[PDB]
Design an enzyme around this catalytic site. Structure first.
Site, short mmCIF file in Angstrom:
data_model
loop_
_atom_site.label_atom_id
_atom_site.label_comp_id
_atom_site.label_asym_id
_atom_site.label_seq_id
_atom_site.Cartn_x
_atom_site.Cartn_y
_atom_site.Cartn_z
N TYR A 183 -6.02 -0.86 -3.02
CA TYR A 183 -6.65 -1.40 -1.82
C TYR A 183 -8.06 -0.87 -1.57
O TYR A 183 -8.67 -1.12 -0.53
CB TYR A 183 -5.77 -1.12 -0.61
N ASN A 231 -8.11 -0.37 11.55
CA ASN A 231 -6.98 0.54 11.69
C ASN A 231 -7.33 1.65 12.72
O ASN A 231 -8.21 2.48 12.46
CB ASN A 231 -6.68 1.18 10.32
N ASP A 271 0.82 -1.22 0.00
CA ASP A 271 0.00 0.00 0.00
C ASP A 271 0.86 1.28 0.00
O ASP A 271 1.92 1.32 0.61
CB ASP A 271 -1.00 0.02 1.16
N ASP A 272 0.41 2.29 -0.73
CA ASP A 272 1.03 3.62 -0.67
C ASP A 272 2.43 3.70 -1.26
O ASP A 272 3.30 4.34 -0.67
CB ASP A 272 1.06 4.09 0.77
N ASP A 315 -4.99 9.51 11.39
CA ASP A 315 -3.63 9.92 11.04
C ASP A 315 -3.68 10.95 9.97
O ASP A 315 -2.65 11.51 9.57
CB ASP A 315 -2.69 8.73 10.66
N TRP A 324 -9.71 -4.31 5.81
CA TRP A 324 -8.95 -3.35 6.57
C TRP A 324 -9.82 -2.10 6.68
O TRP A 324 -9.96 -1.31 5.73
CB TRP A 324 -7.63 -3.08 5.83
N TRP A 325 -10.46 -1.93 7.82
CA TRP A 325 -11.36 -0.79 8.02
C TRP A 325 -10.66 0.41 8.66
O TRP A 325 -10.21 0.34 9.81
CB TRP A 325 -12.58 -1.19 8.82
N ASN A 326 -10.55 1.47 7.89
CA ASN A 326 -9.88 2.69 8.32
C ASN A 326 -10.73 3.58 9.20
O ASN A 326 -11.07 4.69 8.85
CB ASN A 326 -9.37 3.45 7.10
#
Ligand SMILES: CC(=O)N[C@@H]1[C@@H](O)[C@H](O)[C@@H](CO)NC[C@H]1O
Ligand SMILES: [Ca+2]
Length: 647
Positions: free
Chosen positions: A279, A369, A239-240, A341, A334-336
């Site tokens: 993602y 997350n 990711d990223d 941040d 993957w739950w943000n």
């Protein structure tokens, strides 16, 4: 209230004492982790062959043979029975027995137990937390706290992957941890095992990985080092990143090799997980071959993570069907949330909601997350645990209050109050928002509609705002002095002070609205001014991170109501008394489209500026990108979009 709520629950409205003396059956053959918990709860009592029977074990143990048909046939499932004659704690597997124990413990209160029968298991295979945010990684002690919290709540996954760990990401992903960090990880793994949590060590190599054998072996040697620390689950996060590391066939082949030459070759490896470069849907390329390549070539036992339709989003049936169709397996979510941040001047303490509660079969796992604030994250994490275990019975609000009461039983109302007004994110680039201050939004929006038009306002609406400010101050002050969870208090303290300031400003602004006479109005007005300045002081001295520095609180409804009410009464006062009182709502020491101050930068919210003093100038950036370095020139005025100075 049992959390998570069991799949099946029969209650007899009778209760029973806990055996002062009993006879433990299957204490030798059952999961030691579950027998430890049990032995801890029966502390103060003792066993003979005299006394109430307590049978504990796994299907296939001799102790629970009588019950094999009652034990749900699900990984992590368990039967739990309590009645007059005996207690049963039988798991389909060893982790099941342990979960049976986590339920048994919430049933027990004041040496007493309800007559109950429970058949339980999780609707989602993997459930827990991924530490995968940008910002200060969780302290060692916070991590130790998290893992026991996971066990009480039947979370079975901890994914270690803090972006800012340099041994996790570039460039030191190739290097083993040094002694200290390694002995800590080792400890964490042991603590994770004891609580039945899978420690998943993640690595984030994509940004500088070469697709040659040297880098490949370096990754496996790193995986091997973690294995010697006791890690038994692993992930690789792409990711990223940009560049070569985003090649889907390369990634797949790298995952397949790890799978084949490492995961399917150790005696005891559990999860192997990957996070895709694409993602979420908005970041996908529908017409590119990325996601389908992954689904086609990735070995089938390997998990693929997904955050939803956007970077930040809630999981919908259509959304998960969309990804599943491409990856050819049920997505590992993957739950943000509550990760903040990207809105680091906010705390996100609202309930967990928005995720479809009928799609459990379409997901392999569900992980949250969290915020860099570990204990403040427990509210969401507890809610996630509840949702992921029994989505069909997911109760947002109840689970929130339950979370809060669990984390802070000494001052739970106070924390609810605080949390209720610290849940929204404020405008952000991900366009993601949460509700906030819903309980008083009605009375606020009418008080303000009425006011703005000389219509009197409803007196009860004025009273409700008053009651709210009062309650906020009681909450803030009690919270600051709370010593039951000090780590939690340390994390929220700056926001607690700003939250108090907010409520005081609200009280004084309300007093202005009453405003018996002139001298009184002016006292209140000055007090407000000073309260604003204090808010600004906090906002420039706390939480000074490089990205969204400072402290915002009650931003969705309360501060806007306070700000606007202030500007309005100030206007009426000037009209009526021919005054020229200033109506501005945020303190600003510099003068100029409001100015803002961020760290050492002074900016106009996107002809002449006058700073409150002479400073050495750093540079000016403008965008209609222009950039003139100032080279420490003493500067007080700037005439003709951000100015940076020395501070
Ligand atoms: C899969 C994933 O969310 N990875 C990162 C994650 O580290 C961030 O914390 C997340 C929330 O800002 N953004 C997406 C992205 O930046
Ligand atoms: Ca056993």
């Amino acid at each position: 209230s049992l959390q998570p709520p069991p799949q099946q629950l029969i209650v007899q409205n009778k209760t029973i004492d806990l055996p002062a003396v009993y006879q433990l059956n299957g204490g030798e053959e059952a999961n030691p982790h579950a027998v430890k918990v049990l032995k801890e709860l029966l502390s103060g009592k003792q066993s003979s062959k005299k006394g109430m029977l307590i049978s504990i074990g796994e299907k296939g143990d001799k102790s629970v043979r009588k019950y094999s048909r009652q034990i749900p046939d699900h990984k992590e499932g368990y039967y739990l029975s309590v009645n007059e004659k005996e207690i049963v704690l039988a798991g389909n597997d060893e982790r099941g027995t342990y979960y049976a124990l986590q339920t048994f413990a919430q049933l027990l209160k004041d040496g007493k137990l309800p007559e109950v029968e429970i058949k339980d298991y999780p609707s989602v295979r993997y459930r827990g937390v991924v530490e995968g945010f940008y910002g200060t990684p969780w302290s060692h002690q916070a991590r130790l706290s998290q893992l026991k919290f996971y066990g009480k709540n039947k979370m079975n996954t901890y994914i270690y992957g803090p972006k800012d760990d340099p041994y996790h990401s570039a460039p030191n992903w190739r290097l083993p941890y040094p002694d200290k960090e390694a002995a800590q990880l080792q400890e964490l793994v042991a603590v994770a095992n004891e609580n039945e949590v899978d420690f998943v060590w993640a690595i984030h190599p994509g940004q500088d990985i070469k697709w040659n054998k040297e880098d490949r072996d370096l990754l496996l040697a790193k995986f091997e080092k973690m294995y010697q620390l006791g890690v038994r689950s692993f992930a690789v996060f792409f990711d990223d990143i940009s560049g070569e590391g985003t090649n889907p066939q390369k990634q797949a082949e790298l995952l397949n090799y790890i799978d084949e030459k490492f995961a399917q070759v150790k005696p005891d490896i559990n999860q192997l997980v990957m996070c895709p470069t694409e993602y979420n849907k908005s970041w996908s390329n529908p017409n590119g071959n990325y996601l389908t390549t992954l689904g086609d070539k990735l070995n089938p036992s390997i998990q693929i993570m997904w955050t939803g339709d956007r970077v930040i989003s809630d999981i919908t049936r259509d959304g998960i069907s969309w990804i599943n169709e491409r990856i050819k397996r049920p997505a590992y979510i993957w739950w943000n949330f509550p990760v903040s941040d990207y809105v680091r001047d906010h705390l996100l303490l609202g309930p967990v909601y928005g995720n479809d509660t009928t799609i459990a079969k379409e997901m392999s796992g569900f992980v949250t997350n969290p915020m860099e604030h570990a204990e403040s994250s427990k509210i969401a994490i507890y809610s996630v645990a509840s949702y992921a275990w029994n989505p069909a019975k997911y109760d947002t609000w109840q689970t929130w209050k339950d979370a809060i009461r669990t984390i802070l039983p000494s001052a739970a109302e106070e924390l609810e109050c605080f949390a209720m007004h610290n849940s929204d994110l404020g405008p952000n680039g991900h366009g993601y928002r949460r509700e906030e201050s819903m309980d008083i939004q009605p009375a606020a929006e009418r008080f303000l509609k009425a006011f703005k038009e000389g219509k009197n306002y409803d007196k009860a609406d004025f009273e409700t705002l008053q009651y709210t400010f009062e309650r906020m101050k009681e909450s803030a002050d009690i919270l600051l002095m709370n010593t039951e969870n000090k780590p939690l208090i340390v994390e929220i303290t700056p926001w607690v002070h700003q939250f108090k300031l907010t409520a005081e400003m609200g009280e004084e602004v309300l007093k202005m609205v009453e405003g018996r006479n002139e001298s009184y109005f002016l006292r209140k007005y000055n007090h407000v001014k000073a309260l604003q300045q204090q808010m600004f002081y906090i906002d420039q001295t706390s939480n000074q991170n490089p990205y969204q520095p400072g402290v915002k609180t009650a931003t969705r409804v309360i501060k806007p109501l306070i700000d606007r009410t202030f500007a309005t009464v100030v206007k009426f006062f000037n009209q009526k008394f021919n005054a020229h009182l200033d109506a501005t709502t945020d303190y600003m020491p510099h003068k100029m489209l409001p100015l803002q101050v961020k760290a050492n930068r002074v900016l106009i919210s996107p002809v002449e500026i006058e700073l409150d003093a002479i400073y050495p100038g750093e540079n000016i950036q403008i965008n209609f990108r222009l950039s003139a370095g100032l080279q420490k020139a003493p500067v007080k005025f700037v005439r003709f979009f951000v100015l940076t100075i020395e501070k």
